[PDB]
Design a protein around this ligand. Structure first.
Ligand SMILES: Nc1ncnc2c1ncn2[C@@H]1O[C@H](COP(=O)(O)OP(=O)(O)OC[C@H]2OC[C@H](O)[C@@H]2O)[C@@H](O)[C@H]1OP(=O)(O)O
Ligand SMILES: Nc1ncnc2c1ncn2[C@@H]1O[C@H](COP(=O)(O)OP(=O)(O)OC[C@H]2OC[C@H](O)[C@@H]2O)[C@@H](O)[C@H]1OP(=O)(O)O
Ligand SMILES: [K+]
Ligand SMILES: [K+]
Ligand SMILES: [K+]
Ligand SMILES: [K+]
Lengths: 292, 291, 292, 292
């Protein structure tokens, strides 16, 4: 039972992940000011005891540590550099923790401008999904200002199962991209396997039973198969997110001349899925890219 | 479980067959063994097996004969070649092919064996050398249901569990899909660990993070530890996984179903074979990524 | 103007390619006996002066040189080894020229059985398309019995623009697969290019115009693009044939541990096209694998 | 023989392409001021009659139309926005023609800043290679300011075989990326074919001879094969440039949810070639990615 920090916490982006994080931060006794581009999404947290912030700039100005959890590099950059953005609220004292999954260049550029105005910066992307976020069981990958990482102890314990500190700014982005590349590629392979079973007159259910008896058995494999078997593609992690992470993972490899053919093939299947309107369903809807 | 009265034959004392036979003998079966190379049989005579001279004669001597060889080419040769399984079949004899082959091969072999009064069951196995030694294989069977039931004590000895998947052909198709998934995942894991290496990240830390995530599995952990220790001693030969990928793609071809993930994994494994990794563990595909 | 051989010529398989070959053989004054699994296809050559054969065995028994031109390895093997097949008509002296595109193992196995019964064997797969076949402008790739190659001079000159002799049985199969791999992969690339242009608001027509001004300009590129632009996918070379050739080319690489990723990718796109019912259209119908 | 424009012409970037362009501009009687980040590359051009500019800003300030031909989006952006860059020299009326191959977002961002200072902007990327640039036989793809395109008539005729005007800014970038995607993918395929031939005991020379008798015969196919057969990988078009164009083409497809699996595959082979130190050889050096 860790006791919560005195520090006034701000939170920007009440999305699929952010929403669960904030809940758990409030459950565990933190003082939190929330903001979201769409005001309506804040209502449920105001009810759980959050303060409603008017802009990112003002949230940062009011709070000691501000977390942000948005979708893209484009969104992360806009949140910081746009009008009434984070940067406008930064002064010596203020700390910003970016939990968005972006590329290392984005995180480096953002850390630089923030530090240039007297701020402190930590990247802390998260590995998990809506359910894990709601349950407060995310795996947190952090890099940057070590002191700030230690200040976020109670926060990371509320939102998370465990936390890794990976050194200098850039490293958490690089690792998160690799973790998600593995996840996204495996999902493509699972969907390829289930649809091959279907089409060759084999039982998908029996394929899953066999796989669960083997060495490859995992919570992920079982859960994503069950989704497909039930026809349930309600998003636990958005397909568009995983395709983004694959795209960026491939770019990381490009940057160091390292072929990533498995990721490259996965990416093209996910692009097909997006062309078939699956962007806002679960990543498991890549299954629809294989359907005849 | 009490072992069957039936005289059991076993052909092919390879990576998988060797463990199966050991477990059959441990659990009290009467077993006659044969292997193209005679020397591999010596340990098994010491563990109580009878030495068979030819596949034909083992089949002729035994009630149920299991075979476990590498390829479709080897499975076909073992049955159709001189002193092969077919020459020993007569009304009532039973053959259980545990090799991983394509559906056409298993169909062709079933048909010739049945045509001479034999009974046929396909029972490919999912696992590796260690699981085979431990008697913890997952068995996928298809064909003659009565023969499946007769193999009860044998399957319980060699296996953790068993599936019966219906008509001949279905176990082949399923096994290829299972292995396609495994093979493609291994290519992805290798791609992930090498990308970590080359980008200044810790491979060990990558594994630690993956082990805290939802993707944590015995397979993931074991195969990563192999790579991290530089240990590519074969638990499942790389050449076998590339064979299975090749056949899984051929299965898809037959029903016009693209398998691009498999296709990509297959080319990586082909590269590994060109770098002389065929007789190492499937995890040696890691070497196809090394700069 | 080359004077036609005395030899009685047989021809098995009056398909997309075979039909034009036979026409040109008759135009140039050869005595030809034709056979086709479907008897009705042989009618067209009655007025052109062909004799109608009843079975492959009988055609081979009657003729000095018998050409075959069928679709797959399966078909080539069945034509030889099935009931009243080519093998049953072979006796010392008889000559068989297989013009089907198959793998080297198939041609090797077929050559061996035919020679075992006193026959002579040449493989002479053809590069071209229905139009070139009709015009007598095929490129012929031959391997095997050199004497038989020289005996086919007048036939090859009738049906072909030019001919290559590539040595021992197996070599023409291997070369033909590589030629078709290149062609099939290129066609996938062209379709990828035209569809990307469409979807990004560029003019397909102008893409072609630019390509025709560059160093890549070829009859093939122009012709297949004009098909796509006109929506005309009437078969000049069946899509299913090109996918078969890609499949086999990948198998050839497999056999010598040589990755063929470009072919592997092309092959998966062609399989998609087949799932979308394009098997019997032109290979350019792979375009429909890209359509949103 | 067209009469050269009165206008003072500036040229930035005397690389593989720029060098030939400038030589032809001078041959055809234009007044040209040249600049290059490395000063020494300008020396030949003073002999051939060019004025030596000190900075990009100053060249733009001195000239009526300034052409730029640099490697990357990163280089194009730095050339314009860096210290003493193009932007610092722009004033109402001045014209900039960017001939670098970049993505549409880069060309858009650059056109906007230049126009914001009263400049006029045209994108005019070029299709060809060092030899065609030297011969003045490039294909020019232009988009943006139509008036400026017409003012460049003498320049484009000196440096080019032909020119296309594709409309609004962005369109030339998109088209160029597609053209290069096709070229780059095809080169990968050709390399795959020649190496497969090698490894399976066939003659690469004979493969080329057969292809030259077929419908796929092109200057490109012949030239790139002859390079490989002679072991001559001296750059006509840098491999790094073709891999950049493939990467950007794939990014273009990402942007509109269009899978480009052929490009994706080619890109991974080129990345392997870069990992084998082939970046500064001809694009045909992708051959070395296949060598056992
Ligand atoms: N033509 C022929 N005729 C008779 N026997 C032959 C023939 N070819 C190989 N073999 C035998 O099969 C065994 C090869 O299997 P191994 O490489 O150990 O691999 P595993 O046991 O790991 O593989 C078993 C299956 O499970 C999975 C995998 O995909 C396989 O299908 C070995 O005992 C061989 O005899 P030898 O005399 O010792 O060389
Ligand atoms: N940051 C920066 N600032 C100023 N100048 C720079 C910069 N970076 C590179 N460059 C210059 O770009 C030129 C590139 O030359 P080259 O490699 O021969 O390329 P090519 O002519 O072969 O290719 C040109 C384009 O055509 C198509 C292709 O895709 C390319 O986009 C070269 O003269 C460089 O100057 P340097 O001092 O000589 O090194
Ligand atoms: K927690
Ligand atoms: K057991
Ligand atoms: K002719
Ligand atoms: K010119």
């Amino acid at each position: 039972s860790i006791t919560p920090t005195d520090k006034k916490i701000g939170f920007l982006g009440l999305g699929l992940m952010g929403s669960g994080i904030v809940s758990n931060l409030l459950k565990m006794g933190h003082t939190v000011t929330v903001w979201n581009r769409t005001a309506e999404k804040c209502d449920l947290f105001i009810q759980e005891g959050a303060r409603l912030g008017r802009t990112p700039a003002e949230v940062v100005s009011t709070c000691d540590i501000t977390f942000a959890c948005v979708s893209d590099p484009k969104a992360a950059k806009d949140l910081v550099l746009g009008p009434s953005g984070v940067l406008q609220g930064i002064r010596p004292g203020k700390c910003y923790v970016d939990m968005s999954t972006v590329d290392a260049d984005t995180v480096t550029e953002l850390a630089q401008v923030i530090v240039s105005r007297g701020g402190r910066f930590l990247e802390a992307p998260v590995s998990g999904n809506q359910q894990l976020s709601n349950d407060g069981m995310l795996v947190i990958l952090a890099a940057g200002d070590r002191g700030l990482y230690e200040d976020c102890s109670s926060c990371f314990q509320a939102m998370g199962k465990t936390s890794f500190f990976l050194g200098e700014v850039g490293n958490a982005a690089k690792m998160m991209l690799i973790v998600n590349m593995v996840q996204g590629s495996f999902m493509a392979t699972i969907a390829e396997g289930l649809t091959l079973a279907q089409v060759t007159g084999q039982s998908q259910q029996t394929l899953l039973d066999i796989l669960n008896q083997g060495q490859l058995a995992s919570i992920f494999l079982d859960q994503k198969c069950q989704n497909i078997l039930q026809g349930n593609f309600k998003p636990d992690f958005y397909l568009k997110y995983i395709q983004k992470d694959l795209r960026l993972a491939i770019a990381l490899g490009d940057a160091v001349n390292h072929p990533t053919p498995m990721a490259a093939a996965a990416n093209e299947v996910y692009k097909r899925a997006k062309a078939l309107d699956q962007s806002d369903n679960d990543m498991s809807a890549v299954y629809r890219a294989y359907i005849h």
